[PDB]
């Protein structure tokens, strides 16, 4: 199951949205146009990476220790962070981002 997640106008690009599916929290990032989902908490410590994040081209920064991944695949591309991101498949249907919540598939 894809998931309506949000609007492809709502998140512009070098932006992040955090969204909720039950109990998790997700980031949606807008990189050149293209829409992509991590989880929304950093590995490295409890700080939201849409909320407490900057998207520089395709990779977040957390702000909390400057810890850097790559929002396509979650790789980790600045420590401290040792482990990568969650990311979760997207479909874009019109105006709608939608995620596929259950599906969250880890680089390493
Ligand atoms: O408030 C209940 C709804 O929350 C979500 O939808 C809101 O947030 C989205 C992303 O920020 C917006 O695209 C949307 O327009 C808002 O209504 C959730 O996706 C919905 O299923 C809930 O009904
Ligand atoms: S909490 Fe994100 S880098 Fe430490």
């Known amino acids: 199951t894809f ?10 690009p070098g ?26 908490q950093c590995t490295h410590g409890e700080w939201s990476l849409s909320e407490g994040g900057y998207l520089d081209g395709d990779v977040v ?4 220790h400057m810890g850097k991944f790559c929002v396509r695949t979650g ?9 990568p991101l969650k990311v979760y498949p997207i479909r874009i249907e019109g105006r ?5 919540f259950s599906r969250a598939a880890l680089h390493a």
């Open 15 to 40: 932006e992040a949205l955090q969204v909720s599916h039950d109990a998790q929290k997700v980031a949606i990032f807008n990189v050149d146009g293209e829409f992509f989902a991590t989880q929304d």
């Open 3 to 12: 998931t309506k997640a949000c609007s492809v106008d709502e998140v512009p």
């Open 61 to 64: 920064e957390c702000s909390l």
């Open 96 to 100: 709608d981002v939608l995620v596929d």
């Open 75 to 83: 790789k980790v591309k600045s420590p401290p962070p040792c482990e």
